[PDB]
């Protein structure tokens, strides 16, 4: 056989990425044997932090106290190691005497990764010690910090959350979006159905389809936006809810920002982005998820669009109606999903595989646990949910400030429903948004519901990958 | 007509990428005009910050005065703009006061692209406060891209050493070294008697040891690679101190994150930030190759994995000297060269050239010290980096030892070889005459000759330089 005449890009594949995915983070380390121990470090509560770039096949990290990692002065051990060749059944890397003023490494690891986020369990060899001698006995078994969910780290207050939780509101939400969604796709013998219980989109007769071909024009896009603003109004008055200023960026890689790196995993501030994971036999799914959650959509898509939606030019050039359809059907999606968490079992939160079957109503459902951003039936329970959709709300005053600028006079303002709005005009389509029945009862909803729809979340469906994805 | 129906991965294309590294970087920022000024900012020594990921489409940055970029609190106007519909003909972006407690954009900016042979923005700010409808304001602005220092401008190496590097004798050395050896498969009997009557082949003659060939890893042509550099290190090391690099330098940080560290970056003040990838005239091949070999993620996919690997005691374990040299230098050698190489200089002015040295040119400019282009051999040695990753390199040898120390011990034996600290022949050291030029197994004019044999033999009518002729792209890169 013949060695390579040359090197060529090697980007990770697939199983690489996934393997990088399951070692970022921060990991409690525990060493175990009689000869388990490392020069100047206790032989417990030491944590490892790992690191691997998106697409990167090398490995970093650090090993030391908590406190040391967290700390400005560099850590007692670095961690190098690449994963050519390796998988859950074998991960190696070295560690480096970062205090003997040498990058020499002076320890071998290696470890299997067994499926509390995560365990790696494996051996560690001093490399001055020879291999001849007796097996040395140097185990360690390192645990995978739990990322702490949303409503672990914001915490909405009873009143708020108990007008969220109740099932009154939660079928509302469900129901306001699926008749919307689904309107255009629906016979007549649905919709007369809708309308016999005054849950149809919009006026009667007159309809406003949210994802049909004149879904752009038809209005639709106030009926968004409106309708947000109106939860976001109510919300408000029960806790203080600040928008989004900016869009959260990335985290900073462990190699540039190490404390940061490791206090975006605790999730502080409950903005953090949680890692990707791999739907069961859905590639298309996992691979949508995953860059939707990358950094380099962020530089791509959702900083793209934080400009746009501040872009005076741009903005002036759309109705109200064009506005909120065409931010509804792109960015709003992928702010749900980017910011979601695993569906939890709601009787326990257990981290759940598939999601809840959109006319499955179980009474566990309906519990405070399930706030998955995925779903509109809970989505509205996330923390995060009222964070970028008061993002998007602030944008609509970006957007009349872009007509009085261009169009003055020609956007007027106006209470409507005991909310700030603006009339009808030139740039707003109609005049009576749709907040469901009440602009146009609990079993009512689920009758509807149950029209309509009698496996990916509601917020995915009308997921597309690219071409080069 | 349709709006889309949902969004979709939108990484930038080929025109996107260049736009935004053309944006990416430090500006001299000048405005102009009877209106021209930011509240809270003087009207002449500005500087404008920007970046744009290896493949975003978003434009963010910075925009104060030099030390408040540089300073911790957050500078005076920050820019946010994105590149739809953009290009050196029209770029767009909103400033916002950061000062004032609101993100809301108060300037609206649009400029044009020129390069005016490291680049220029010049165009238009807009008051969002003031309409439209009102007198048309007179509010300009000028920035130029500041210039990328040079490795040479950062490391200064003495007289003496830099003397030693850019003699012709020592230039021609170095290319006919490595000419010899990479070419020797494909010379023919004629080429190869020829070199044989200089003295010029590789290695031990009749059993020249060629670098390149089919058994380029079992013939122990890589030690013939380390034994060599290691010996310029020591002569290198006698003039000047050269410290070696302990570790591979990280990409640049990006904005978002360091805004100093980012701005420093652009001032090389170490000699070892990375060049910025230029474009190739007519080889789109080799503009996305050297793109690539200079982006984050070939540091992340490549350069660190070589540098886990061969710091690895079971990876060297496995090879012998010449394996290890051999891989090394076929792999990671070339990519280090091309990675810190900064763009071909005329050597009597240094102005950017898009045309690499013809091989057997021997114009009496080439051999300026201005010429120390890191892409060829006649020039690589003359730039400081080029120490710097030799160094790297060496050091490995010593973890190659201590791999087999461990694994093998008592196989390796250490041994004085040409004054230099070197390796015993053995299990895992092939041959025990490294090939040092006709030194070890054997003039000016005798080089130039050498040289004409194996380059100007055939035809000289693709143009790239050394350390890319043997490039190779990934099936996803083009």
């Known amino acids: 056989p013949q060695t390579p005449d040359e090197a060529s890009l090697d980007l990770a594949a697939t199983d690489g ?6 070692l970022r983070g921060l990991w409690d380390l525990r060493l175990v044997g009689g000869d388990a121990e490392l020069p100047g470090l206790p032989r417990e509560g030491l944590q490892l932090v790992l690191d691997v770039a998106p697409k990167g096949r090398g490995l970093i990290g650090y090993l030391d106290t908590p406190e040391r990692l967290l700390a400005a002065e560099p850590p007692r051990f670095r961690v190098l190691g690449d994963l050519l060749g390796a998988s859950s059944a074998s991960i190696r890397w070295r560690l480096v005497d970062q205090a003997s003023g040498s990058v020499a490494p002076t320890h071998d690891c290696s470890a299997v990764f067994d499926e509390g986020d995560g365990t790696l369990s494996g051996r560690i060899q001093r490399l001055e010690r020879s291999p001849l001698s007796p097996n040395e006995d140097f185990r360690f078994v390192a645990v995978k910090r739990h990322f702490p969910l949303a409503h672990e780290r914001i915490v909405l207050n009873e009143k708020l959350l108990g007008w969220l939780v109740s099932p009154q509101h939660r079928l509302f939400h469900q129901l306001w979006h699926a008749s ?4 255009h796709r629906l016979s007549e013998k649905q919709r007369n159905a809708l309308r016999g219980v005054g849950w149809q989109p919009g006026p009667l007769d007159r309809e406003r389809d949210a994802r049909g071909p004149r879904k752009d024009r038809n209005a639709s896009g106030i009926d968004f936006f409106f309708m947000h603003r ?16 900016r869009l959260p960026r990335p985290v900073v890689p462990l190699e540039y920002d190490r404390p940061g790196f490791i206090r975006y995993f605790d999730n502080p501030d409950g903005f953090s982005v949680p890692p990707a994971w791999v739907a069961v036999d859905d590639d298309e799914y996992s691979e949508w998820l995953h860059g939707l959650k990358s950094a380099e959509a962020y530089h791509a898509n959702f900083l793209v ?36 968490s695993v569906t939890r ?8 595989m598939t999601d809840r079957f959109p006319a ?10 399930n706030d998955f951003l995925g779903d509109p039936f809970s989505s509205h329970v996330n923390p995060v949910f009222w964070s970028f959709h008061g993002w998007i709300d602030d944008r609509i005053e970006d957007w009349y400030r872009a007509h009085e600028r261009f169009h003055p006079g020609e956007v007027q303002r ?12 030139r740039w707003v389509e109609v005049g009576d948004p749709w907040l469901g029945p009440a602009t146009h009862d609990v079993e009512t909803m689920k009758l509807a519901l149950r029209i309509i729809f009698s496996r990916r979340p509601w917020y995915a469906r009308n997921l597309k990958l690219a071409r080069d994805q």
């Open 17 to 22: 990425i996934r393997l990088g995915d399951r």
């Open 180 to 183: 919307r969604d689904k309107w």
């Open 230 to 245: 109106h939860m976001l109004h109510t919300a408000r008055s029960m806790q203080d809810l600040p928008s989004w200023e």
């Open 305 to 340: 669009w934080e400009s746009q939606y501040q872009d005076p030019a741009y903005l002036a050039k759309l109705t109200l109606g064009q506005f909120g359809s065409e931010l509804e059907l792109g960015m709003h999606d992928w702010l749900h999903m980017r910011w979601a």
């Open 345 to 352: 079992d709601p009787s326990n939160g257990a981290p759940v």
């Open 360 to 369: 499955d109503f179980a009474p566990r459902w309906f519990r405070p646990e």
């Open 414 to 425: 106006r209470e409507v429903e005991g909310i700030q709005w603006f009339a009808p005009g």
